[PDB]
């Protein structure tokens, strides 16, 4: 219970402030531990409400304790800002926003489960912010009760957990910071049970036994952890787990810390009415009043709370080990400032200078009961913010010279953010956390308030600007198509970063900058833009049907009439020729003579074959060709249109699963026709050529080609490794690595391997990589398209079922008409 003056006074001694948060999965006792801190040291003031965003704690340390702080200190009082944090992590930018206003973190890990992925993810982001961690291994009660673990197994579990945490810390912490790893013997690891209400540090026991052993606690805390053994028989401390005779010695941690706790649990839970009193009296635990009548769990909870109040263990680590803003801003200043390292504002941040020009970072907007009004939440890194102070509001795009995102207004009121309540205060100096009212409209989400025209913007969130997240959108009710199509246009007009287009497989595609952006776009589409039910799904990928070699034997097919026959063979068109056709070097309408010369002289074709191409397909211009190689066919000219038409048909619909053919060359070897045109009409020859083409194709070692993206990723050096890791899991192929900006990695990524790519990429790069993708080329899959179990076969089988086709692919024999 403090007055505003008392708060303001506490806020003046920034050396004695601790800005931090709790990094913990909700299921690991996050709430219970924070509640414990609040109940023990929460600060309350001596008709609006907001969403609780931060809580203020007050803690006092003894004169001797304060001397242990390896940091500038002034007095024995401390103000601790416990900043609320989401948790939902896969490396979200929101989390990074809350972390940004903190300098230290209390990391909660589970005794049994250890370090979960979420916690690892948030810790990594925290380390990326140069935040110093302190750890609490929670839920010890579970190991004692459920698993009935032994003292040594518990110790080993603790040791493994501490190691897992330090692996992460040693991997992501900046070298300039020195050793940021956590050490039980140094008092930076606590152990306890949030729900139960107890916890301890080695320092607390070292303090509790230093005088009893007649040694200074510095020596005691080193002896109460790790390989230190006190042999009662020799009265000596050693680092050997066996005595002279080779007999096993019990670890000091187990002997002096775990044993007392184990015996309390055992004695109390087993209702040992006579032992309990002795044990309590020996540990100087005094029960008062009705507590003396308690038994079992109820008694245990009461005994442990008096024995090792959890909050006390946590506050100790926060005060003695987490940095103050003064300490932290010295090495965080540069990261936080996008401007010159030797700039006046940067220097003011480095020195946490309250007299300098204002540098206040708005971390987020907090919802209030003030009719739709939100209060800005953030931290004063330099200067002092004041009520009715002219300030410069700079958005995520504001740049010194250009007036983009600039907003010069007078701060209506500065308020302390005490849980769900606010308390107006005249001003707030550098180093503190604070809330601002009246900043609503001028800013939304992150921002920066400065009182310097030269003031640059504090580190802004980098955001994707490419429509890399894409999905297929279809109406649930056919009749609504007109509304969807219209909606897409409306959506596009209202949003510059959204992309909509028709896919090669006839699907309406909606693409956004990121998952969240795409999600907003799809919601507004279904609800407003189109205002009709929609079905969202992973876009269907288009494939191409090709041949790996020449037909193993002449393909023969006859017309329904049975009077006409076509003999042909299919073979591959070289990639460079297909590309030449697709890109306009070799064209359907070019003079057949000049075109033949190019194909022969430049692409190695036989000039006669080239001069005799009957057509390109599909659509008369695709990268597939029919070459006449017949010799003495009397009515050849009369079946040409029919042969061409059939090819347009076959190349549009391949025999593997109906996809378009690509790079297929068909050579008409011979044709036998009935003398009378009456039996040689299109209705007879078209079916014949189509049937023979499919046969030739199937006989030519059929293959399917998949679409491949050219992916370009910008990112910091130490994150490049993530790119390669993900690419290797998705048949990616690095193309290049170029660069004093960032790194740009280019690679090939199969389109059917890109769904969700964006998500796994940020996961492997700690949300530091930005992907861009554009269709690049077709790639032939080597596996057998006709084998349902191969890679290509799996794709083919799935598409066939999706189209209601018979699962098995009709073989070449199905189209072959023996003589």
Q: Which residues are annotated as a binding site for GTP?
A: 24-31, 138-141, 193-195
Task: Look at the block and give the residue holding tokens 């009082």.
Answer: 77
Supply the DSSP symbol for 131: P
Cα 430 from Cα 24, distance rounded (Å): 28
Q: Which is nearer to ligand SO1, 539 or 722 (CB)?
A: 539
Q: Which is nearer to ligand SO1, 667 or 705 (CB)?
A: 705
**What is the closest distance, in whole angstroms, from the C-beta atom of residue 4 to ligand SO1 in the complex?**
55
Supply the DSSP symbol for 585: S
Q: Which is nearer to ligand SO1, 430 or 711 (CB)?
A: 711
Q: Which is nearer to ligand SO1, 395 or 539 (CB)?
A: 539
Residue 184 Cα distances to 142, 284, 319, 330, angstroms:
21, 25, 16, 27
Sheet arrangement for strand 54-60: 54-60, 77-83, 17-23, 104-110, 132-138, 189-193, 198-201
Q: Are 209 and 256 in contact (CB under 8 A)?
A: yes
Cis ω on the peptide bond leading into residue 621 (within 30° of 0)? no
Q: Which is nearer to ligand SO1, 570 or 751 (CB)?
A: 751
Cα 819 from Cα 630, distance rounded (Å): 19
**What is the closest distance, in whole angstroms, from the C-beta atom of residue 90 to ligand SO1 in the complex?**
23
**What is the closest distance, in whole angstroms, from the C-beta atom of residue 503 to ligand SO1 in the complex?**
3
Q: Are 667 and 571 in contact (CB under 8 A)?
A: yes
Q: Is 373 helix (H, G, I), strand (E, B) or coil?
A: coil
**What is the closest distance, in whole angstroms, from the C-beta atom of residue 548 to ligand SO1 in the complex?**
20
Which chain residues interact with ligand SO1 by CB under 6 A? 467, 470, 499, 501, 503-505, 509, 511, 539, 541-542, 707, 751, 774-775
Residue 766 Cα distances to 118, 172, 181, 562, 783, angstroms:
12, 10, 20, 67, 35
Interstrand relation of 702-715 and 733-738 (parallel, antiparallel or unpaired): unpaired
- The two structure tokens encoding residue 328: 């932290």
Q: Using alpha carbons, select from 124, 112, 204, 220 the residue that is nearest to residue 165.
A: 124
List, as residue ranges, the binding site: 24-31, 138-141, 193-195
Residue 560 Cα distances to 136, 409, 564, 813, 818, angstroms:
82, 85, 8, 17, 14
Q: Which is nearer to ligand SO1, 621 or 629 (CB)?
A: 621
**What is the closest distance, in whole angstroms, from the C-beta atom of residue 477 to ligand SO1 in the complex?**
23
Q: Is 424 helix (H, G, I), strand (E, B) or coil?
A: strand
Q: Which is nearer to ligand SO1, 385 or 511 (CB)?
A: 511
Query: Could you tell me which residues come within 8 angstroms of residue 143 by beta carbon, excluding any fewer than 6 positions away?
Result: 111, 112, 149, 154, 157
Q: Are 500 and 508 in contact (CB under 8 A)?
A: yes
Output phi, psi for 417, to 5 deg. -100, 90
**What is the closest distance, in whole angstroms, from the C-beta atom of residue 795 to ligand SO1 in the complex?**
11
Q: Which is nearer to ligand SO1, 56 or 470 (CB)?
A: 470
Other Cβ atoms less than 10 A from the Cβ of 818: the count is 6
Q: Which is nearer to ligand SO1, 224 or 580 (CB)?
A: 580
Q: Are 732 and 757 in contact (CB under 8 A)?
A: no
751-758: long-range contacts (C-beta < 8 A, 24 or more apart)? 751/541, 751/706, 751/707, 751/708, 751/709, 751/775, 752/541, 752/706, 752/707, 752/795, 754/709, 754/711, 754/730, 755/538, 755/539, 757/468, 757/711, 757/726, 757/730, 758/464, 758/468, 758/469, 758/514, 758/515
Q: Which is nearer to ligand SO1, 346 or 580 (CB)?
A: 580
**What is the closest distance, in whole angstroms, from the C-beta atom of residue 542 to ligand SO1 in the complex?**
4
H-helix or E-strand containing 408? strand 406-410
**What is the closest distance, in whole angstroms, from the C-beta atom of residue 464 to ligand SO1 in the complex?**
13
Q: Which is nearer to ligand SO1, 23 or 469 (CB)?
A: 469
**What is the closest distance, in whole angstroms, from the C-beta atom of residue 150 to ligand SO1 in the complex?**
57
Q: Which is nearer to ligand SO1, 503 or 780 (CB)?
A: 503
**What is the closest distance, in whole angstroms, from the C-beta atom of residue 754 to ligand SO1 in the complex?**
8
Q: Is 744 helix (H, G, I), strand (E, B) or coil?
A: strand
Half-sphere exposure in the Cβ direction for 256 (13 Å, CA) = 28
**What is the closest distance, in whole angstroms, from the C-beta atom of residue 745 to ligand SO1 in the complex?**
18
Cα 307 from Cα 581, distance rounded (Å): 83
**What is the closest distance, in whole angstroms, from the C-beta atom of residue 496 to ligand SO1 in the complex?**
14
């Amino acid at each position: 219970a403090f007055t505003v003056d008392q708060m303001r006074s506490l806020m003046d001694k920034v050396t004695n402030v601790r800005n931090m948060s709790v990094i913990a999965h909700v299921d690991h006792g996050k709430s219970t531990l924070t509640d414990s801190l609040v109940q023990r040291a929460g600060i309350i003031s001596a008709g609006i409400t907001i969403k609780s965003t931060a809580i203020s704690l007050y803690s006092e340390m003894s004169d001797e304790d304060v001397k242990e702080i390896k940091q500038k200190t002034d007095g024995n009082s401390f103000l601790i800002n416990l900043i609320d944090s989401p948790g939902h992590v896969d490396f979200s930018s929101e989390v990074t926003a809350a972390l940004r206003v903190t300098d230290g973190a209390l990391v909660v890990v589970d005794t049994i489960e250890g370090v979960c992925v979420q916690t690892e993810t948030v810790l990594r982001q925290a380390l990326g912010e140069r935040i110093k961690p302190v750890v609490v291994i929670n839920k010890v009660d579970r190991a004692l009760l459920e698993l009935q673990v032994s003292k040594e197994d518990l110790y080993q579990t603790f040791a493994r957990t501490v190691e897992s945490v330090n692996v992460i810390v040693s991997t992501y912490a900046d070298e300039v910071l020195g050793d940021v790893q956590v050490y039980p013997a140094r008092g930076t690891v606590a152990f306890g049970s949030g729900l139960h209400g107890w916890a301890f540090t080695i320092r607390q026991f070292a303090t509790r036994y230093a005088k009893k052993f007649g040694v200074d606690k510095a020596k005691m805390m080193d002896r109460l952890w790790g390989d230190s053994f006190f042999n009662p028989k020799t009265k000596k401390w050693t680092n050997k787990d066996t005595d002279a005779e080779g007999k096993p010695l019990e670890r000091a941690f187990n002997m002096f810390i775990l044993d007392p706790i184990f015996r309390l649990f055992t004695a109390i839970m087993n209702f040992k009415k006579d032992e309990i009193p002795v044990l309590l009296e020996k540990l100087e635990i005094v029960l008062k009043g009705d507590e003396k009548d308690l038994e079992g769990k109820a008694l245990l909870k009461v005994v442990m709370r008096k024995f090792l109040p959890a909050a006390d263990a946590l506050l100790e680590m926060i005060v003695l080990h987490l940095p103050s803003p003064v300490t932290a801003q010295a090495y965080r200043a540069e990261q936080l400032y996008e401007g010159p390292a030797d700039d006046a504002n940067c220097i003011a941040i480095k020195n946490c200078d309250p007299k300098a020009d204002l540098m206040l970072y708005v971390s987020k907007m907090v919802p209030t009961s003030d009719k739709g009004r939100f209060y800005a939440f953030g931290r004063v890194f330099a200067g002092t913010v004041k009520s009715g102070q002219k300030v410069r509001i700079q958005g995520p795009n504001y740049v010194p010279g250009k007036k983009d995102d600039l907003f010069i207004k007078a701060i209506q009121r500065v308020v302390l953010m005490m849980g769900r309540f606010v308390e107006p205060i005249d001003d707030c100096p550098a180093g503190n956390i604070i809330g601002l009212v009246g900043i609503d409209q001028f800013l939304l989400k992150t921002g920066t308030l400065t009182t310097s025209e030269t003031a640059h913007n504090m580190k802004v969130m980098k955001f994707s600007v490419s429509p890399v997240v894409q999905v297929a959108v279809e109406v649930k009710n056919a009749n609504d198509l007109p509304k969807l199509v219209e909606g897409l246009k409306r959506l596009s007009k209202s949003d510059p970063c959204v992309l909509t287009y028709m896919s090669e497989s006839g699907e309406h595609i909606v693409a956004g900058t990121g998952e969240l952006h795409l999600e907003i776009c799809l919601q507004d589409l279904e609800h407003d833009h189109a205002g009709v039910p929609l079905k969202i799904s992973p876009p269907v990928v288009a494939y191409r049907e090709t041949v790996e070699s020449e037909s193993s034997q002449t393909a023969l097919s006859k017309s329904p009439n049975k009077h006409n026959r076509i003999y042909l063979k299919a073979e591959p068109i070289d990639e460079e020729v297909s590309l030449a056709i697709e890109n306009g070097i070799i064209n359907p309408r070019d003079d057949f003579k000049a075109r033949a010369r190019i194909m022969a002289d430049d692409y190695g074709w036989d000039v006669t074959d080239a001069r005799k191409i009957w057509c390109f397909g599909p659509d008369g211009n695709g990268p597939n060709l029919v070459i006449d190689q017949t010799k003495a066919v009397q009515y050849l000219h009369e079946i040409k249109d029919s042969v061409v038409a059939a090819f347009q048909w076959a190349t549009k619909e391949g025999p593997i699963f109906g996809e378009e053919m690509r790079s297929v060359r068909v050579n008409i070897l011979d044709v036998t026709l009935h003398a009378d045109a009456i039996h040689r009409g299109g209705g007879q020859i078209i079916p014949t050529m189509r049937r023979a083409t499919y046969a030739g194709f199937l006989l030519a070692d059929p293959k399917i080609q998949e679409p491949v993206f050219l992916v370009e990723i910008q990112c910091p050096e130490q994150a490049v490794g993530g790119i390669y890791s993900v690419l290797n899991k998705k048949r990616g192929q690095v193309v290049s690595e170029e660069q004093t900006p960032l790194f740009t990695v280019k690679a090939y990524l199969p389109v059917n391997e890109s769904f969700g790519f964006t998500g796994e990429l940020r996961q492997a790069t700690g949300g530091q990589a930005f992907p861009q993708m554009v269709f690049d080329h077709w790639s032939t899959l080597g596996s057998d398209p006709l084998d349902p179990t191969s890679k290509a076969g799996e794709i083919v089988l799935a598409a066939r079922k999706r189209h209601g086709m018979k699962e098995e692919v009709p073989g070449w024999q199905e189209y072959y008409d023996k003589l």
